[PDB]
Structure formats: C-alpha cells, structure tokens
Amino acid sequence: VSSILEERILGADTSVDLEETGRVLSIGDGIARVHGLRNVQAEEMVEFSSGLKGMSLNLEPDNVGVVVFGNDKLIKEGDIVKRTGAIVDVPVGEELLGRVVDALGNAIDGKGPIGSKARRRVGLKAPGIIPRISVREPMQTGIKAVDSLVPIGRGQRELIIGDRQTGKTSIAIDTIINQKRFNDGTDEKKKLYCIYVAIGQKRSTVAQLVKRLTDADAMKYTIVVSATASDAAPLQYLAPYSGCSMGEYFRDNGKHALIIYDDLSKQAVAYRQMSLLLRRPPGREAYPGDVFYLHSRLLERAAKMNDAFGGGSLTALPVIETQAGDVSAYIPTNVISITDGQIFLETELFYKGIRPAINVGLSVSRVGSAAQTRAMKQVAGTMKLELAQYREVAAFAQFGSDLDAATQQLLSRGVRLTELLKQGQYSPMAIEEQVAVIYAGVRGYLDKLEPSKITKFENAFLSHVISQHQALLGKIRTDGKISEESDAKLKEIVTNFLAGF
Amino acid sequence: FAKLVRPPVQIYGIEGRYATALYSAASKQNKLEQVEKELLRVGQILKEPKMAASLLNPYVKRSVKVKSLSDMTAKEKFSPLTSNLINLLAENGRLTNTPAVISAFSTMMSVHRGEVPCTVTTASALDEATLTELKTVLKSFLSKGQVLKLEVKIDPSIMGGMIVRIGEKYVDMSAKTKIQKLSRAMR
Amino acid sequence: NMMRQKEQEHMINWVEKRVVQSISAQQEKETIAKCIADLKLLSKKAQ
C-alpha cells in the first residue's frame, strides 16, 4: 500500500507564504477575540494555528471577534490566527449529487473526496426584480393534499410549519422521492435536483434519512448537506447558505433545483447563540435584530429566473417547528411573512387518521391556480370548493341526522373527500393518478360507498388503472388536460369499476 | 473640538486614550523626544517604595496625591506637558495604570521613528554570522527608511527551519508545521 | 477493506513517528540556507 501513499505525499502543496496574522487575546464559549488582523474583511475565513477555522464576524475597533468552527479546546490565549483573504465559499457542481457534505462542502460520507471544480461564495445577493419571471410551472410533490389544494410551483417559497412529530420531514422526503420519475425520464425541463439541508438533527436521523433515499434510489440526484446537533454553532448558522449556494449553481445554470431546510428554527437558535456570545444587543425572545434579515436574505434566493438568464429555478421548503400551534412566536411569524405559502400540519388531524396531517383550513399558497396542470386544476377547483363547504358545517357532523338533506349531502361528500386525501408514507403518485382518483371522488362516484371502504377503493382503483389503461393516463399526462373524450373515458372506467366492487 | 494629530499606531483602552492625547499634544510644540525622556524618568520615580506605596492606598485624599505629585514634579523639573499629564492621571484616579500609558507611548514613538518589530524563532541555537545574513535579508522587507529591531529567540520545541514575524507579516517555515501539513494532506 | 484500512492507518503513524525522530539529525545548515533563499523569493514577490 506504501506504493499508494507516496503519491498521497507527492500530491501536496509545501510552499509557504507571507501572510498577515493576529494573536488570540481570549477564548471561551466558542468565541475567539483575535487581536491584530488589521486588514481582515468582515465575514472572512481565518485559520487558527492548531488547524481549526473561524469566520471573523465582529470587527471591533481594537480586536476582531472570530467564531470558531469547532471545539475551541484546541485554542489557547496566545495562539496565532492567520487570515486567508477569502469570504466563506463552498464547492458546487454536479459532482455533489449523491454525496453527503457538511456545512463547508467536505464529504462526511467517506466514499471518496468531492471532485468539484468550481467554488462559489455563500453571501451572494438574490436575483433582482427583472431577472425573475412569474411562477408558472408546477412542482409535483406527489402528495394528494399538497398537490391539489395547496399547490407548489417552481420558484416559490412554501413554508412547511407544524408542531413536533406531525410529519414535516416526511412530506419533504415524499417530495424528494417523487422526483425520481422525472429524473429518470428524458425531458430536462422537468428534472428537479433536490437538496436537503439537515440542521440540528442528530447523525442517526440523517443516517436513517440517507438510508431511505438510497433504498428509494433517490440519491443519484440529491445532495444532503448536514450541520448536525454536535457541530459548533457556526456550522449550523452556515449550512443553509451552503445548501442555497449549491442550489444557486443549478438555478443560474438553466437547471431546476429544490432545497429543503430542516429546520430553520434551529439555524435561528444557532445564530442567537453566536450573537449573544459575541455580546450583540438582544431583542425579543433574545434573538438579535438580524433574525429577520438572516432568513429573508436566504429565502429570497429561491427564484424562477426568466428565459434570458437561463430559465433555471430554485424552490424552497423551509421546515418550521411551532411550540404547540403558537404560530405567533417570533420565528414562525418572521418566516411566515417571508414565504409565499404555508402547509400547516396539526396533531389533532394526525391522530384522527388524516395522514399526512395537513390542515387545509390554514394552509394556503399565494400562487394558487397557477402552478397546477390544467387537469389537476379542473379537478381541484371543485374539490377545494366542496371541502370549503364541508368544513364550515362539519360542526354538525356529530349529529348529521336531524338535519336537512342538503347538509347531509355536504357531509357525505366532505367525508369521502377527506378519506381520499389520506395517503401512505413514501408513496407519492404521479399527477395523472391523482387526477383519476380525485375525479372518481368529486364527481359523485363514491357518495353511495361507505366511508370506511374508500381507502380500499382508492388503492384498488389505482392498481386497476395503472395496469389496464396506461394509454388513457398517458393521454392525460402528455397534454395536461381532460379533453371531453378523456373525460368520458374516465367516467366509464370509474362507473364500470365501481359496479364490479 | 480642536483638530488633533493622530499617532502612527492606534492603542486602545485607557492607556490608549491617554497616550493618544499626550502624543498629539507633544507633536504640537515638537517636544516628543524630551517627552519620552521624561516619561521614562517618571517610570522609575513612580517605583520608589514610598511613592509606589502612597499611590496605591485609596485612603490618601485625592488632593493629597495630586499635591505630592506636583511637588515631586517640581524637583524632577519636568516639561509642562509631562507634569500636566502626571497631574491629569492623578486626579482622574487612573495613575494605577501609569506604566500602561508610558509603555503605549513608547510603542507610539517607536513607530513614529520607524522601527518595525521583528522576531526570528529558530529550531535551536543560532550562530551570529547567520544572524548577520538574517538581518541583511529581512531589511529587504521594510519600506524606504524603516529600521529593524530583531529579537531572536531559541526554540527546540519546533523541529527545524524558522518562524519569522515582521510587524504582522508572519512566515512559518518550521519543519514541524511541514510535518503536520503533510500528514494532513496525505490523510 | 478492513485489513487495508488497518494497514494504511498504521503505516502513516509508524512512519510519521519515525520522521519526528529522524529530524533530530544535523541537517541544520541546509534548512537555514533554504529558508534564507525562501526569504529572498518572498521579499522579491512581496512588493
């Protein structure tokens, strides 16, 4: 093996340089107070002698407050900090796809090193007002509720907000898995290069996640950044920008990306620690004054460039955890007033059996009708109106009888639609199968079928349409509308099938 | 307020403010060199056991300390600037850190006359002919006029080569760092 | 794999520990001359 390690030695850079330098005055809690570094740019990567990094965050008149990228056990008052001249930057490209990188783009997967050629800053500005063009394409998440009632176009920030253990990461992972059908096909105007930033999670959780993605063979197009719970505060404050830059590469390279921060309410906590230790003035809930600028300058990179800047895109699905439906806390409102929507998840719905536990009453998308295909648009308009009518008179549900036949009809329709929206886990469905199911649901081809059985029907119907009438589904998919011929054919399939069951 | 001439180097804290004030006031009236002489003198004059003992007790009325400083500064016959500075420090109560002031002022005058700090940490003992070549080559880094004030230091803790500091510029060619760099690169 | 990982991770430590005691020889003059040349080059390229 020694024959192999001598090219390891040869492939080095032994040269030295005349570099600037300061000396640590203080250290503790993860915050060095370097003295010197007279020509240090704000937000620049300095290197301590022992080997760590640091990001010279707080240029005070006499000393520079640097934040160590790791345990400062290795640092002592007296050490030498040598500046590098470079703002924080990270590798990018398509070499990352399928890897697992940490906050600074260093493969923590073993599995060899990253072979990226091009690097890129992390503190770039979002594209202006002219580069963008209106949000028009849909991002099929593969989830019935999300994909019909609260649509998600490409280039749109869509908060996924909800209490703990309601199925937020599950929605994001179903979204990631669904893109397989696109990323295996041919057209390059439908390929989504998912990214998944894992902040504050424990490495066991990220490991299980990458196991899910590998089982579903959904890593060949996914990057998985990870600033896990044990990584010092700066590496969690900085992971979302690493992810967003890895995605900006695609966006400005005429490709379509998708980035999922999980959570952002832990990047905010990491930044609060970084600030409170640097002694910056606190504010409400102890967050600094930048905890809006922080997120805003992040969730405003998710754009949809026009056709002169390439036509790329970058969706964004920040996951937020709210303490017992306290949507009025500081961070939930900071990140609810930046994004274009919200997919609210609730635990009353998760245990009633409505999984995914989406709460269509509170969930909205501010693109709306656009960001849907004409087929799903036709179906979901009526579905949305019917569900809205149901919700406002669901209070009588516990009675039902003793009431007018009109509200009895409304309940007998809303119940079926609610049961149709229930979905499995890691079982996303192509748009045309969603259209088929919800067509069979909203046109009355179940009102006479007892609610308890609807789920059965659903699955059965799918298996009876996937393996039988693939031609019809292809007709619906290739041109995303229901031409009267396709409408009547769907009616016949639904009716005759229901008859034989 | 009145325009004041900034020092060449900036020192910060209490000593920073006092040294900057004194340096700017001395630059006017051009009494810098004699001011530094008097500062060195007060250095020792404030280390005699009786003076250094009565200028730490906080139960000596402030006016008593100010008057004793005035009397001592008559005998030593200081310039008006230095006597005024000693007074000032006396009644602001900040004379406990007089050594910080003068020291800072020295660093403020050294850079004024242009003697950049330097340093050469060596792997082990060093010859003096080697020191001659070292000085003659480091003089290649200065600007046109500066002077070199090299403080050699022996260090066997490093492995080989040397570490050279010049002002801030820090060049590290010690074999130790080469070893850790190589191990890092090939790990 | 496991055997190769063990082998290489021991090779590296063994040889580096040999080197950290091999440097104690008397090659000082060569190092000093090389470093003075490096000063020459840095000063030249530093302006």
Partner: peptide, 22 residues
Amino acid sequence: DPVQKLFVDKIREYRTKRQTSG
C-alpha cells in the same frame, strides 16, 4: 523539485517502510 528536505524525507521513509513489507 529536489529542494524539499522533510517532504522527500517522508518519501524516502515510505520507500524504506514499503520494502519492509515482504
């Protein structure tokens, strides 16, 4: 290329420890 003392020292030591295997 020949200037490096400690680098090529590491290389020579690796050759020597390579021959030691066998």
